[PDB]
Design a protein around this nucleic acid. Structure first.
Length: 89
DNA sequence: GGCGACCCGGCGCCCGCTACGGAGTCAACTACGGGTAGGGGGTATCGGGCAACGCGGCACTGAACACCGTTGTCATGTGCCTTG
């Protein structure tokens, strides 16, 4: 499990995330999932911040850092021929 | 045992442009240890603002000469009157 999780942290995401940011983001994600499961509603950012014990600015920071790129070579969907990489200047 | 079908894969394409919708995603943890990165603290080095001098144009110094220009000046020449 150690080797597998190290590999997932260090080689899964297109934009590399440090291992301890990786555990921070997965911790906040799983606990937020628990918040949704308990309260049955999207938790407010301040409540999440206190649950994580960090301040809201770190919450927003890791939330924004925990994304993944979208591929240009995808159909635009407006038309089959068109692709996303041919619409951004 | 090369022919033979047939079989199968395997591939290759599948009119033109504009113009025309949106979007966005399920499964660890903590301990250490370093190294860097930032913070303020303090310090040597470079840059911007004022006083003394030098010029430079012209300007005054007119003073001292020069340039016409003027009415000073005049010993010396025409015109009338008196006498040979």
């Amino acid at each position: 499990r150690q080797a597998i999780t190290r590999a997932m942290a260090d080689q899964a995401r297109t934009i590399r995330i440090p291992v301890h940011m990786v555990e921070v983001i997965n911790k906040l994600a799983r606990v937020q999932r628990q918040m949704l499961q308990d309260l049955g509603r999207e938790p407010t950012p301040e409540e999440l911040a206190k649950e994580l014990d960090m301040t809201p600015e770190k919450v927003i920071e890791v939330q924004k850092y925990g994304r993944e790129p979208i591929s240009l070579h995808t159909p635009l969907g407006e038309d089959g021929d068109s692709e996303f990489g041919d619409l951004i200047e």
